[PDB]
Scaffold this active site. Structure first.
Site, PDB file in Angstrom:
ATOM      1  N   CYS B  85       0.876  -1.169   0.000  1.00 50.41           N
ATOM      2  CA  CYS B  85       0.000   0.000   0.000  1.00 50.41           C
ATOM      3  C   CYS B  85       0.915   1.221   0.000  1.00 50.41           C
ATOM      4  O   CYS B  85       1.899   1.265   0.747  1.00 50.41           O
ATOM      5  CB  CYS B  85      -0.933   0.020   1.218  1.00 50.41           C
ATOM      6  SG  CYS B  85      -0.215   0.558   2.775  1.00 50.41           S
ATOM      7  N   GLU B  86       0.603   2.196  -0.853  1.00 51.88           N
ATOM      8  CA  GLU B  86       1.415   3.406  -0.977  1.00 51.88           C
ATOM      9  C   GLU B  86       1.304   4.308   0.233  1.00 51.88           C
ATOM     10  O   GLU B  86       2.162   5.159   0.461  1.00 51.88           O
ATOM     11  CB  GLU B  86       1.012   4.194  -2.222  1.00 51.88           C
ATOM     12  CG  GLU B  86      -0.449   4.610  -2.217  1.00 51.88           C
ATOM     13  CD  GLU B  86      -0.873   5.312  -3.494  1.00 51.88           C
ATOM     14  OE1 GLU B  86      -0.415   4.884  -4.581  1.00 51.88           O
ATOM     15  OE2 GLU B  86      -1.671   6.275  -3.409  1.00 51.88           O
ATOM     16  N   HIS B  87       0.252   4.120   1.018  1.00 53.18           N
ATOM     17  CA  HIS B  87       0.048   4.940   2.191  1.00 53.18           C
ATOM     18  C   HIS B  87       0.986   4.627   3.352  1.00 53.18           C
ATOM     19  O   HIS B  87       1.532   5.556   3.951  1.00 53.18           O
ATOM     20  CB  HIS B  87      -1.402   4.836   2.631  1.00 53.18           C
ATOM     21  CG  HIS B  87      -2.370   5.362   1.619  1.00 53.18           C
ATOM     22  ND1 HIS B  87      -3.735   5.219   1.743  1.00 53.18           N
ATOM     23  CD2 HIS B  87      -2.169   6.055   0.472  1.00 53.18           C
ATOM     24  CE1 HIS B  87      -4.332   5.801   0.717  1.00 53.18           C
ATOM     25  NE2 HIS B  87      -3.403   6.316  -0.068  1.00 53.18           N
ATOM     26  N   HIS B  88       1.188   3.344   3.668  1.00 51.64           N
ATOM     27  CA  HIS B  88       2.059   2.966   4.786  1.00 51.64           C
ATOM     28  C   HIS B  88       3.262   2.124   4.400  1.00 51.64           C
ATOM     29  O   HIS B  88       4.106   1.828   5.234  1.00 51.64           O
ATOM     30  CB  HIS B  88       1.284   2.197   5.849  1.00 51.64           C
ATOM     31  CG  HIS B  88      -0.001   2.836   6.244  1.00 51.64           C
ATOM     32  ND1 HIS B  88      -1.166   2.658   5.531  1.00 51.64           N
ATOM     33  CD2 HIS B  88      -0.310   3.652   7.280  1.00 51.64           C
ATOM     34  CE1 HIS B  88      -2.141   3.334   6.111  1.00 51.64           C
ATOM     35  NE2 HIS B  88      -1.648   3.946   7.174  1.00 51.64           N
ATOM     36  N   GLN B 126      -5.742  -0.406  -3.609  1.00 48.08           N
ATOM     37  CA  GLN B 126      -6.511  -1.493  -4.205  1.00 48.08           C
ATOM     38  C   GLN B 126      -7.453  -1.082  -5.337  1.00 48.08           C
ATOM     39  O   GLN B 126      -7.514  -1.768  -6.356  1.00 48.08           O
ATOM     40  CB  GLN B 126      -7.286  -2.274  -3.139  1.00 48.08           C
ATOM     41  CG  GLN B 126      -7.705  -3.640  -3.651  1.00 48.08           C
ATOM     42  CD  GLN B 126      -8.316  -4.512  -2.582  1.00 48.08           C
ATOM     43  OE1 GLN B 126      -7.793  -4.613  -1.471  1.00 48.08           O
ATOM     44  NE2 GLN B 126      -9.424  -5.159  -2.916  1.00 48.08           N
ATOM     45  N   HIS B 154      -5.213  -6.192   4.053  1.00 45.97           N
ATOM     46  CA  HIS B 154      -4.274  -5.087   4.173  1.00 45.97           C
ATOM     47  C   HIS B 154      -3.649  -5.191   5.544  1.00 45.97           C
ATOM     48  O   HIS B 154      -4.335  -5.052   6.554  1.00 45.97           O
ATOM     49  CB  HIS B 154      -4.981  -3.737   4.025  1.00 45.97           C
ATOM     50  CG  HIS B 154      -5.485  -3.469   2.640  1.00 45.97           C
ATOM     51  ND1 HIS B 154      -5.255  -2.280   1.984  1.00 45.97           N
ATOM     52  CD2 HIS B 154      -6.220  -4.230   1.794  1.00 45.97           C
ATOM     53  CE1 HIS B 154      -5.828  -2.317   0.794  1.00 45.97           C
ATOM     54  NE2 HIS B 154      -6.420  -3.489   0.653  1.00 45.97           N
ATOM     55  N   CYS B 156      -1.812  -3.194   7.087  1.00 45.31           N
ATOM     56  CA  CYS B 156      -1.840  -1.950   7.838  1.00 45.31           C
ATOM     57  C   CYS B 156      -3.165  -1.784   8.572  1.00 45.31           C
ATOM     58  O   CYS B 156      -3.340  -0.837   9.336  1.00 45.31           O
ATOM     59  CB  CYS B 156      -1.606  -0.764   6.905  1.00 45.31           C
ATOM     60  SG  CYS B 156      -2.849  -0.593   5.610  1.00 45.31           S
TER      61      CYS B 156
HETATM   62 ZN   LIG Z   1      -2.154   1.216   3.991  1.00 44.79          ZN
END
Ligand SMILES: [Zn+2]
Ligand SMILES: C[C@H](O)[C@H](O)C1=Nc2c(nc(N)[nH]c2=O)NC1
Ligand SMILES: C[C@H](O)[C@H](O)C1=Nc2c(nc(N)[nH]c2=O)NC1
Ligand SMILES: C[C@H](O)[C@H](O)C1=Nc2c(nc(N)[nH]c2=O)NC1
Ligand SMILES: C[C@H](O)[C@H](O)C1=Nc2c(nc(N)[nH]c2=O)NC1
Ligand SMILES: C[C@H](O)[C@H](O)C1=Nc2c(nc(N)[nH]c2=O)NC1
Ligand SMILES: C[C@H](O)[C@H](O)C1=Nc2c(nc(N)[nH]c2=O)NC1
Ligand SMILES: C[C@H](O)[C@H](O)C1=Nc2c(nc(N)[nH]c2=O)NC1
Ligand SMILES: C[C@H](O)[C@H](O)C1=Nc2c(nc(N)[nH]c2=O)NC1
Ligand code: NA
Ligand code: NA
Ligand code: NA
Ligand code: NA
Ligand SMILES: [Zn+2]
Ligand SMILES: [Zn+2]
Ligand SMILES: [Zn+2]
Ligand SMILES: [Zn+2]
Ligand SMILES: [Zn+2]
Ligand SMILES: [Zn+2]
Ligand SMILES: [Zn+2]
Lengths: 84, 194, 194, 194, 194, 194, 194, 194, 194, 84, 84, 84
Positions: B85-88, B126, B154, B156
């Site tokens: 995931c690009e966020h975390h 996603q 996920h 995260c």
């Molecule tokens: Zn994430």
């Protein structure tokens, strides 16, 4: 070009209303304020307006069209109008 | 332009350096026996997880074949997929299910899987991953319709934050007749099950 | 001394800076919409995954209770555990199964899970994690015996390298009567099943 | 002396008063529509969860029957059990599995279950509950052996604290030949499975 | 205004007091070893079970993101949820399944879960809980449609009253296209299964 | 002497009369449409449930065959069995698992099942039923060993009394080498599973 | 008027006498050790099985609550149900699944179960029981629709007659929108599954 | 000497004649459309079911290979097997599990299956079939040990007689170390499971 | 006219003689110990397998009952069925699922099963068997609709010929509203599942 | 405003009957006794009445409307009326 | 009362045919030989006849009605008639 | 007998076409060349022809009928004709 076919999905009290295919009258489409687009998944272009179908029916009255038949196919509502 | 093997060599040291920095910033001792080669292993690993950046759909999207004799639904289900995931920068993993109804063009079954690999091995979201897969198939085949469903966990969301184990994220893209025809969509949805 | 909240604040910027650097070294644009807050989110995430370093078994291992009236096997199975392998900094996740036969001291059920969290929430190696949990219980209770089993999936083995999906690593520590008595071990192993 | 129906009448108002007090202390409005009859429903419910206090094992433990002609293992598995942990007054639920090898005395199958209800329906600790059930059967029958296994989910471990969903606590008591004979214990453990 | 940490400190003693009273009113001895710290543990637990009152949807409902490029069904299934029935103050637990079709706005996956936590951690009624989650998602995203299904076990129906073990309560809210389009609803219903 | 078809004819009227009486004593109207033929249907059914009394093991226990060439374990598992508990006249149902190691005499497979039918089709107690089946096989074959396990649900424990749904009663008789040899008993127990 | 506790006392002896008569007519000896208290246990049991006659839907059907704010489907599935077929006086057992879409009135979840208990605990026919439950919910709530599905095993079909083990009888009542709307019926049927 | 293709040709007419006679004796009309070719189809089918008579173990039992380098357990599980009971000429079907520990000779995996085919395609008795398989492997390899387990459903016990559906017959032969060593037998029994 | 007990006595010898003939024609020795009584057992068995010929649907089809008060779907699923294919005289076994929607007449649940027995116990073809069951129910009840599904394994396709183990044949007859109404057919199909 | 679109769900012998969208003739809506609402889930307003469609058709007759076409779409019945 | 709505379910060659709601013309309902009932599950009364819709259409012709539109909604067939 | 209802299932370019119920005009049914049958499962008789609906429509024209409305219900196509 006497015959016209317009449609709307799911609920009628809100748009968008599909008002034409690739070979539709460019002038009529413009009069309706319709834009041309090709939604992802469809292999064809369509003309649509954000107006609910009722508004579009009134506009077509002005351009001399009359509803000949209305039907439901799936969750889509379709109107068959004729230049009368 | 896609990333290259040369790019990975030039950047490996900086990655390694960054990870080594992270180890110290966390309170660990980068000198410690089991952590010595970590900076390079972590770097190499992260490069592998993002190897999709060094490939372009064009290549694969050019091996479509003309065939209008096979009017039938083609499905490739349970395709293992691992992404970050690009966020975390934590990975989310699960499966991808692809289905399509051809018009005049078909695609090799393995090629469908490669599409999943090119996009999934990148920093992702996603929803985007799902659309990219579907769009690729659409542009390469101009099919009557296409369906793509992704079911993943996920990390995260399990290992932190809301911390919901068991929790899964399902994303579904239905295009063309897969969206219009109820018989079509219901069939795809059934054939990809259990 | 264990890590502290102050330590996390002072080091958060360095972590964020390192992750920001990693993004660039991978070929991504740290400016891109969905990647802006990433350096902080990844950093915060990594600190949470390693929050075990800011705790010491001492605290928890000091809430043992005297009780020689409960000669029975105590098992807490299916404890969810999430850890990070120290070799690649990719997480490995699964479950922990704990069992013991007390002598004169017992431990609160929730406390057993807390032992798992303190150790799993660090950079680890499954074998070390297993032993630490077992040794903690051993030194806190001086039990007749103790068993600890860990079943986990190492992402660095599924998402890369040998790339064996479905593959799972199981580690088992049998101490005292759990090792000596065949009746005891067999019971533990059965009661922790399905 | 056991609790009585009279005791429940005299104490119902105080319980109701206490729960009403709890509602206010939580920030709710005890006047609010769906909270009006709550103080009484909560009190009544709590008295039911603890109705084991108004019964004594003596009664049930006196319906043992002489019989030395049935040398076979008797098991009553999957007995549903609902209890309240005394530490947080949150319930823990699961199943109890009982087994025994008689000497000269037998016990009615339904009576075994009633032993579970008498002790489970109190403020408890899983270990004590297990032992009490075992001790009752032992003192009522003087069997060759007896086994009692309890599998339960402690809500105070799922809904809070260590918050480990999926987590389960298993307690097992093996007495007499169930402890000495490996063939006996293995048999019981197999027959109570799936 | 939402509850606060200060509110919890001021009210803790009253709660503790009320629970201590409940212990006596039930027939127990609050002095007994394993019951000493119970009044505080129960009160603390009860405050945690109702921590949703100290949060407002406003916070979470303000992190919506504009995005009309992801026309696909988004589902987050098997979200563990623990709540307390307002009628008996006994907990009901199970899972929540959320699904929606965006128009122009999207919501972070973890945020969907936080919406569940805010409302589920309060004294509740399953129907109301379901609606609140659905209403929240609607007001935050103005989606084409949304679906929320909750499956839970009500302890007040298993441990008492009708005493129906195995019994489960499922509540389902279908809004917008999820209600109008048969293809949409059937898809969501399949994708949230097994 | 066993019961006979003549005995059933003579007694049918009295049974029917007794059931008719029961209907009235319950508050029903024996004249009501769907209750007219009930007194006879109930009687006939109760005679069928107890048809074991009109048969004697002697018949079946005289079709043993000499054979000392088949030194192997013979098992007939999942034999459906329906019986009536003599205490409440409610039926208990489940399965019977039989196994034996022959010496010089063997028994036809279908005959093992017939032994179950003769004894189960009576007013019973699970423990007695189990032993009677085991003893029959023992006396008819003089085997090296024999095992009989019965798993059943007692309706009088589900529909009333302790009301424990899910609850099951298992009885196990191990004779000869099935009792002495751990290898033997473990084998039978495994082969009769799932 | 509904049956009463007094009615049960007056009739218990007659029941006991009839069952004692049945024992003799079957060929048993009512004097035999384990058959002595049977006439009373059987009678008491049969009264419990038909305790539905001493209750009237009126009581329960008057605790409906006004609420037009919860436009969602409410389902209570897997409600254990035990009944006696009126034709043979043998029990049929299984599960009941209830679902409804409210208009302006709702019903407490536990009350739905109580409706099942009132009608199922009588001499019944599965089709009637289904309808009675459905009609009760309809008349008490005037809902937009209601669905009731019962899955049971009739012992009189397994233990005798056609003797079809594995065989199950399913009865389904769909009223209002549950019958008219295909989307509605499909949803209920899915949500009550596995 | 084994049966031959010539024997099958000479006897086919008589078989067909006998089946034709059977049709008339059953009350059917051999002239009826769908029964015309039955006499030949039935005969041909019966000759196929008994084709084991036209083969001799000798052939297969002569392809053993010298090899004392593979000291490990060899198991071929889930071998489908279809036979005809010699008592009623109705088929019994199921699976065969074979295992052995070699000394100096090994047998090709497919050959083990052929041994099952030669003996199962005859008029049989499950115990004999089991032993013949075991004996063949023993005589061909002189192994350290061998195990043969057969699980099958006898149609003459399901479709008639005792009419026990769900019922299964398991026969087990343990020779050599498979009988003596508990470690060995337990391993074989585990590895052939699920 | 249906077959009679007298017909069976007169024809039993001819059958036995044919089976004796078959044994010799296969190469077996009808004198052999375990084959002596086979000719009579095989004959008796075949007569039982075809006992449906000695019954007429008229009898059962005349026990319909007037009832227009139960507008609900009635299903009787998992009816075990054993038949003989008329082509090879090998049995095909499996389950039958029946469902109907009444108009003014209903049929006793056990009677439905008897319809299945009358037609399945004959030389058959699965499609004919299905239709006959459906037509019987139609003609006896004039229902709104009816559905009949048969799932079976044909031994002549598993033990020989195409030899496809795992292979199953499913036949489905949908009449009336079961064919016309999509909601109806989908409901039956769901309710007869798992 | 010559064209009008009204609908009713599931069963026709009972209301409510949807009689208008946001841009519907306020006066006509009032004449019908319709109220304006926004059902949860819909991103638009609607005008409705508790009368069954038959009653609404007779009322529209009085205001000079005629049914041109009627169709079913899903479980919803729709009427297309024209000011004639 | 110019407008009328009648319907029939699943198959048209057989009744019953629904011919009215609670506020239907009692006289017209009587002329058709219709009975009033409230089927379990429905929160409203209906008028029905055992005649197939064809027979009911001919009867309505005699009372001066004309079919304006016919549609299918679900498995139900509906007719919109007008007093002409 | 002014009104007539005919239908065809699944696909229109092929028959059979259902043209009548038990009380249909025997002469008209004969003119169309229709046979009477009772399909298993239906509790009523029907008149049908193997001709596709188009052919049946032209034949009804000759006997003075006009298509008033056409609709789909399920996978069945239905035509409402009037003697005009
Ligand atoms: Zn994430
Ligand atoms: C219009 C046409 O019938 C449609 O595009 C198709 N649908 C399907 C198809 N094939 C399958 N298997 N499923 C479909 O839904 N071939 C063509
Ligand atoms: C020596 C003594 O018998 C041994 O330490 C014990 N083992 C066991 C026990 N209890 C159980 N349940 N299982 C054991 O293996 N209590 C004591
Ligand atoms: C000493 C004696 O053999 C021992 O107590 C017994 N064990 C057992 C038994 N029966 C069973 N089923 N299992 C046992 O372990 N009967 C007696
Ligand atoms: C009108 C439009 O077809 C509708 O809002 C949509 N439905 C769906 C969708 N996407 C999926 N996957 N499923 C749907 O039912 N995108 C848009
Ligand atoms: C003494 C002798 O070895 C013992 O009785 C036997 N045990 C066994 C056997 N066969 C099996 N399959 N299992 C046994 O435990 N045959 C003989
Ligand atoms: C007419 C209205 O749309 C219908 O009664 C409803 N159906 C449903 C509903 N809610 C759910 N979950 N499912 C439905 O089918 N609320 C209202
Ligand atoms: C004596 C020797 O240890 C014995 O024959 C062996 N047993 C075994 C073996 N290998 C396995 N896998 N299992 C055994 O039990 N190899 C040799
Ligand atoms: C016309 C009428 O709605 C139809 O015959 C019925 N269908 C059904 C019914 N009941 C159920 N459960 N399912 C149906 O599809 N009762 C009547
Ligand atoms: Na629209
Ligand atoms: Na309506
Ligand atoms: Na009809
Ligand atoms: Na057609
Ligand atoms: Zn690693
Ligand atoms: Zn606790
Ligand atoms: Zn409650
Ligand atoms: Zn009993
Ligand atoms: Zn019955
Ligand atoms: Zn046989
Ligand atoms: Zn065949």
């Amino acid at each position: 070009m006497p015959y016209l076919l317009i449609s709307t999905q799911i609920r009628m009290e809100v748009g968008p209303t599909m008002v034409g295919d690739e070979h539709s009258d460019p002038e009529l489409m413009q009069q309706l304020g319709a834009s041309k687009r090709r939604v992802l998944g469809n292999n064809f272009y369509e003309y649509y307006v954000n107006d609910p179908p009722r508004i579009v029916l009134d506009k077509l009255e002005c351009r001399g069209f009359r509803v000949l038949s209305m039907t439901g196919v799936g969750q889509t509502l379709v109107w068959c109008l004729h230049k009368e | 332009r896609p990333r290259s093997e040369e790019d990975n060599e030039l950047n490996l040291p900086n990655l390694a350096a960054a990870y080594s920095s992270i180890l110290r910033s966390l309170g660990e001792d980068p000198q410690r026996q089991g952590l010595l080669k970590t900076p390079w292993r972590a770097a190499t690993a992260m490069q592998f997880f993002t190897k999709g950046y060094q490939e372009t759909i064009s290549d694969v999207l050019n091996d479509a074949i003309f065939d209008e004799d096979h009017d039938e639904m083609v499905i490739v289900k349970d395709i293992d997929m691992f992404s970050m995931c690009e966020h975390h920068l934590v990975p989310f993993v699960g499966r991808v299910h692809i289905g399509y109804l051809p018009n005049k063009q078909v695609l090799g079954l393995s090629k469908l899987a490669r599409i999943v690999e090119i996009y999934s091995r990148r920093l992702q979201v996603q929803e985007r991953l799902t659309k990219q897969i579907a769009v690729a198939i659409t542009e390469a085949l101009q099919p009557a319709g296409v369906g793509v469903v992704i079911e993943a966990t996920h990390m995260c969301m399990v290992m932190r934050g809301v911390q919901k184990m068991n929790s899964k994220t399902v994303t579904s893209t239905m295009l063309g007749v897969f969206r219009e025809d109820p018989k079509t969509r219901e069939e795809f949805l059934t054939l990809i099950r259990s």
